[PDB]
DNA sequence: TTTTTT
């Protein structure tokens, strides 16, 4: 119940996505990472506990409960999404510059463009 | 007790099935999905909790109890079932299209047909009408590749029949040859067909035509399982020969071949095989059995919008309407592909002598 | 204690057996079944809970206690048993048919025959009847493919005997060639047999005929274990084409009771051979070497009736590879694919079994129909 | 404490042993059983509970508490044992037969001989008799296959000696070829031997002759470990058509006490050779290289009696590959499959074993019967 | 707390050690043992419980508690120790024998030498006596195999210098026991296997003809810390058309470390202490001849035939034998019964004492390999104007090309000329 | 959470670091151990017990709680760090040598330099001295293998400049062909260098260029040898990636080098050092080791300073 | 993971 509520609150931030190949991508440190190379979902669960209310933060300091929240999260993800399809973009290490206005969206808006490759310098 | 009751109630909806090939299939999001690397049964248990009483639903929130329910369900499935047994049904990502009536089913009506494959895209019921300028404009590329003259009636009818055959989930007794020059309409037809049926389409090379099917892994033949159309696109200028035994083996309902690291050697053949040829083919051996399995569609109409509009999936639900119409036209009541052994120069002498 | 009592009661019913292959076989839904990667003991424990006292049945609703009962059961099984030792029993999904007499056993009577293979479908007593509208059509089809004339008597008898040998769980001493020209009905027979016997039928590639059978993993040989019918199709023109000849040693290895070959990721190299091997062809076979041993293991059945379309009716009556020309039926493959003549053909096969398996059924060679054997026949 | 006492009492009966190959063997049902996929130690713990006091037997009905006893036992076994060191003992499911005495041992008498292999069936003392209705049939069949004539005297003795080598658990320095024309009884002898000795018999492929033996995993050579009989069949005439020669070095590695080769997913590369290797052939073998070392390891037994149907009776009388023509029997094949002549053939093998162990038994080559 | 105290007390006994590879070696039954598929630490914990207070021994009867102590012990082992650093110590199942001196150590006196391998059998003092009929029979057998004559003096000495199978150090040469059939080459192998037991290993021919990689190679991984490696049989490299011996494997089998790991293991490095002996009826043929390869090959020849009475005439009329004797059919069974194990061990120790003067090393014999004949003459004739035709006629003026034709053909063509005659 | 508080204080020591390879490095026994098997974080947790409050130390005696702390620590490491950054440091198996400065940062002052590859042997300063016989025992050697005489001046400068180059933790983009004949002393160089940098020195064959690349990471020197005359070839498409790699690639030959195809860009990445002046048991006995170490350090504050 | 496959 409480852990399911915590998993539901995390699921509302769209920080974890499922790809068609059969893997998960996690939005941590302002970048879309990949699983199958060290588990990153529990790292995200531990790093997001500040946004959750106070009674939902002390529960996430327990490694076993974080695994329960992870198991809950992996069950609510049923629809797959594609990665890096938008042809007019230029990712950077603070966001993704657009290709028409010259605008450079960062942070919350940069999460919409699910990109795994990048230029390599700040902006 | 209570978890066993939940598992029994879930099993009554027939949402989990055991297959002949040895896999589990689950009905999630208007599709049948295979249990091979992800825990789909627990996902189904979590999703289906809204069709349960208020006392059985507040208990499926615990991941530990969902595993118990899954374990109970796994012991209840003892008898396997057969899938993909409806040749006149077209599956999508959201339901099944009936090629006879034209009706579309999306939910509990779609799960009655156990289709494990799909086109890979969503169906649009608003552009599948007849009207609208899109369809009226699509009668300008087809009518240009194959004109509507009196000298081209038989060839165009054969072309339409061959294109219609890609909608049927059944075994075809002939392999078709698209014979023509460059930029004559063959690639446009290939791209339109790929857009219209999506993931039910496959491109191969020459390993299935010139080589031997057995004796080792053949990943390009086990990939043709339950797929409705296969294109042999890039023919080298014939080098290895056609090896008529291979084309004979590609006609039977069952095809022998195994993937890498696998022991399964049987595949179901529902594919319309079309070979794009620019030069006269040469066969290892020509006999009456080879004559009975070859058809030729010839492109003899020499010709930048028609390069990205097709790639943008613009003619996706317009070409599909034409395919359904031609499907209806050529089922009277059984559609059968017939050979044309006179349209091959190599078969000229063998007919008389 | 209580769970041990449940396990002991389950063991007394002899519903779990250990075979001399490492497998555990269970008796669920009137059939012996096993799965290497999906152990079925807990499924049997769940299914058998209605033959126990009501206090012992509730405890079996817990998945964790079923595992305990399974662990107790696995420690009770020490000795192995031999399976598939009755050649005159045809196993179905819901019972066993006795080919000697004709009765169907659908309970503990079918349990004593430890058959680990089956047709895959249930047996229907209302269609294994003989007189039916479907059976009359089957007689017409079979009579068209193999007419009952005086010049086709021996060929028709060999055809019937080869077809009826597919119901027997025993090692056969010959490989048969269904030889004929195009559109002579030698695939209709194959489809009819596949409909009749179901999962007791298998198709394999030509590599079992032309390649070495034990150079690494060979899934095309390990899939013939306990199968009663193996089909090969469309060998190439060995003469007017550059093709690999058959190999006389493979033919001799495909006749022995035990065949050597292993699957991928497996250490088991022995397979039981219970199969009738049929190769359907448009050309006569060509071998590496001809000797008396090879000429003793091969039989040939001829197909000489052409099923054509009105256009080719005149061209067919002139060709000398055909003895009769009949109009093609375009709605026949669909009827076979829907298993319309499944039980009529099963009844026909059982009747032929009765005719030919008295007292002992044994396949015999037909060396006179092979041109490659001509020279050795001259002397 | 209490489970430790149970484990200590179990280990005092010497019912569990650890072998030099790092493997666990358990004495169950009058047999030394071994399997790495079965829970044999817990099986023994469950089966041996009747020898324990009543306060301990009821403690062993829990699967969880049998695993504790199994762990306690596993921590107690440090030393290793040799096993399979008696060549004059034939093991069965329910005991061991003494080939030099003829006496069957059961219980703790068979436990002394640590045999980890067996025929796979139970020994019946009412059929191991020299006077049966089946013995006359078996002698008739064998005398038909190998006649007792003056012209056939060394061949028959070599046949008997080779067949009786399959009872000895020792390394043998010769390979034998059963050579003959079609329908001469070469497979009937193989089937009779397989019925007689059961699981001590193995059939393998020709890849152990014409290929390398230790390049990657090779179950075809790894399954011959501690087997007393290996059969190969259908040599593909390495003379006329395109073919691969046998390999002279492969023959020499098959006569060594140890054979190098490993199974799948296994680190064990040594196999102990106790096998008589027999190859059924219609043509004489052809080798890539001929050497004096190869000549010392080859023996040939010839089959020259034809079993034919009456229709083919006339044609067999003109073939020089045959010395006698006899009527074929179609019930023989099915009767052999039903293990009708199991114990009669076993008695014959033991009787010949006593005949050919004149102190020691040594297989000898026949170099004169090879065209090469 | 209490289990941590038990682990700490067990650690102070120095009965568990960690090696550089990462192995855990335990001191049990007066021997150092390591095994990745055997619970050795819990075995030691169960065995050592009698050296602990009474209140601590009761805690060690529970297998669940022994695993906690094992985990605690595994967490305190942070430093690696070097093992098998004494070449002149022969470990048995119950102690260590000093080869240079002859004293047998038992208990804590053998624990000082961290010998992690063993013969597998106990050392017997009453059989290491040199005064027994078994010794006379063994000496007769050895003298039959390798006669003590003047013409065999240099070959018998190389045969004796077998005694290298006792040294726990890297050997820089590979030896071929080359001979005709029935010459005693397998009898020596069986005697050595009986004498040294588990320090002897037999592998396949793929270590000489295949490529050594990082993949799972049990045939290489099973040679770790072994003092004798035998490879039996070698095909004829000309008439059979088989794979030749790769020259790069000869270099890698001489280095102190070899690359190869078992299945389901990450131990990629193996320590090389082995004498490599190959039993042959044919002399080796290599795919690439060079000066480094010719420095690592030695050949011992067997020229005594043991034959049955029928075959004595042909044996005496053969140029591959110098002596013909009668075969003994009971010797093979006696050797398998470990009858000459300790007599042969004593003989090997006596030979070991002879060839340490004070350092023993193996010398190659390049003149016994026909494959090396061309390179020796070129090396001793040439030293690294001069027309090609002049060089051709000068080099063919003395040598005959009836056998060395392709050799000079390849040397002139492939190896193109700053070369001056001596 | 007591265990989370314990894991907080262990991360405020920088004893566990995450690498871009996907693994962890642990500072245990005064060495940045980097292992993909065996539990190192639990070993560190048990060892760091004494630097923790009294109530926090009793909790770490349970393996079950140590594993929980390990899981907590592994869930808090999100950002990777790079190892082996400083180029002027010599990792010895006691610590780190600060080349351009003179002092050995012995045991704990060498944790900021996250070096993962060492010379494999200990280092001292009593024998690493600025004088004493061993300094002159090889003066004759280093002066007769390579003299100067104002005619072999630049040759010797390059000789003992590319020698000192095998002390730099930065890419040496140059392939100096050690020309000369036999017995000129290029094997004395070979044995003096194996006795200077230990496992930081690697040997190879002709295959590196004529046609041993995986195990060249942080390798500070390669000394390909035993080469036959080419007149395969140098395969000129190799130097493009060969010099693109923390090693000074030294090729010593007894013959003339012939490249596959010389262009206007090929003769800009090749150096040469000639030996126009054409021990063992004592040179392999590590008699100098630290003396040759000083010789290299001496040549380091030379030409390579302030840039090479 | 090893085998299988290259
Ligand atoms: N008794 C029958 N009456 C009418 N049509 C029939 C009959 N038997 C078979 N056919 C049809 O005849 C056609 C040819 O039969 P088929 O089994 O394919 O012969 P085939 O020899 O295998 N052809 P091929 O593989 O090229 O040699 C098929 O369309 C069958 O449905
Ligand atoms: N000193 C001996 N006295 C009597 N018999 C002996 C003696 N040494 C060896 N033998 C026997 O002689 C036979 C041949 O010896 P063996 O060890 O097989 O030589 P081999 O070289 O390995 N044979 P091969 O593999 O063909 O070259 C065996 O039966 C030995 O037991
Ligand atoms: Mg057909
Ligand atoms: Mg036979
Ligand atoms: Mg030998």
Author numbering:
A (entry chain E): 324 to 446
B (entry chain D): 324 to 561, 566 to 630, 653 to 702
C (entry chain C): 324 to 702
D (entry chain B): 324 to 695
E (entry chain A): 324 to 484, 486 to 708, 733 to 764, 774 to 779
F (entry chain F): 324 to 534, 543 to 562, 567 to 579, 596 to 629, 655 to 684
Give passages from the manuscript:
Helicase E5 is a multi-domain protein; its primer synthesis and DNA unwinding activity are required for genome uncoating and DNA replication of MPXV. MPXV E5 is encoded by the E5R gene, the mature protein is 785 amino acids (aa) in length. MPXV E5 can be divided into 6 domains: the AEP domain, the ZnD domain (Zinc-binding domain), the D5N domain (a domain associated with D5-type helicases), the Linker, the SF3 Helicase domain, and the C-Tail. MPXV E5 belongs to the SF3 helicase superfamily, which normally forms hexamer and unwinds DNA with 3′- to 5′ polarity.
To this end, we constructed and purified one MPXV E5 protein (aa 322–785) with N-terminus truncated, which is termed as E5_∆N hereafter. As shown by in vitro DNA unwinding assays, E5_∆N has no unwinding activity towards DNA (50 nM) with T15 at either 5′- or 3′-overhang region, but the forked DNA can be efficiently unwound by E5_∆N. About 60% of forked DNA is unwound by E5_∆N with a concentration of 50 nM. Like the E5-ssDNA-AMPPNP complex, the 6-nt ssDNA fragment was captured by the SF3 helicase domains of monomers A to D in the E5_∆N-ssDNA-AMPPNP structure. Structural superposition shows that the conformations of the DNA and the four DNA-interacting SF3 helicase domains are virtually identical in the two complex structures, indicating that truncation of the N-terminus does not alter the DNA-binding mode by MPXV E5. Compared to the E5-ssDNA-AMPPNP structure, the overall resolution of the E5_∆N-ssDNA-AMPPNP structure is higher (2.67 Å). Three AMPPNP molecules were captured in the E5_∆N-ssDNA-AMPPNP structure, associated with the SF3 domains of monomers A, B, and C, respectively; the conformations of the AMPPNPs are identical to these in the E5-ssDNA-AMPPNP structure. No AMPPNP was associated with the monomers D and F in the E5_∆N-ssDNA-AMPPNP structure; their ATP-interacting loops are disordered. Compared with the E5-ssDNA-AMPPNP structure, the gap between the SF3 helicase domains of monomers F and A is wider; in addition, the helicase domain of monomer E is completely disordered in the E5_∆N-ssDNA-AMPPNP structure. In the E5_∆N-ssDNA-AMPPNP structure, only one C-Tail (of monomer A) was observed.
